[PDB]
């Protein structure tokens, strides 16, 4: 259930504000080598980030 | 006492030095103190996050 606001082209390898399904943050987006199962959408590390 | 037993003392020192390496490598607890230090630091950082 998201909203009017529109889907900007995905910018990678740049410090970009990102809003993924209401999860907002700051960082660079890079190709990910970890293999998610079909079901998860979020990834977290040992530090709970 | 040294000069009359120079070869024996040299051999004993060499044997003890040789045994030092094996004694350090055999038991991981010998260096544990230093490891403990590092571990503590890690824990502190971890709990902060």
CB pairs under 8 A between A and B: 5
Partners of residue B46 in chain A, C-beta under 8 Å: 46-47
Technique used to solve these coordinates? cryo-EM
Whole-Å CA distances, A25 to A35, A37, B25, B37, B46: 22, 23, 47, 34, 21
Resolution (Å units): 2.6
What is d(CA B8, CA A15) in angstroms, rounded to the nearest whole number? 69
What is d(CA B16, CA B39) in angstroms, rounded to the nearest whole number? 31
For the record, the structure tokens of B10 come out as 């040299």
Q: How far is A41 from chain B (nearest CA, A)?
A: 22
Strand pairing of A23-27 and A16-20?
antiparallel
What is d(CA B17, CA A19) in angstroms, rounded to the nearest whole number? 62
What is d(CA B12, CA B18) in angstroms, rounded to the nearest whole number? 10
Find how far residue B30's CA is from the centre of its chain: 6
- Of A27, A19, A26, A25, the closest CA to residue A2 belongs to A19
Partners of residue B49 in chain A, C-beta under 8 Å: 47-49
What is d(CA A42, CA A48) in angstroms, rounded to the nearest whole number? 11
């Amino acid at each position: 259930v998201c909203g009017p606001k529109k889907s900007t082209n995905l910018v990678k390898n740049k410090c970009v504000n990102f809003n993924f399904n209401g999860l907002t943050g700051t960082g660079v987006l890079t190709e990910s080598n970890k293999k998610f199962l079909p079901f998860q959408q979020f990834g977290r590390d040992i530090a709970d980030t | 006492v040294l000069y009359e037993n120079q070869k024996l003392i040299a051999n004993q020192f060499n044997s003890a030095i040789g045994k030092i390496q094996d004694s350090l490598s055999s038991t991981p607890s010998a260096l544990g103190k230093l490891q403990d230090v590092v571990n503590h630091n890690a824990q502190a950082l971890n709990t902060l996050v």
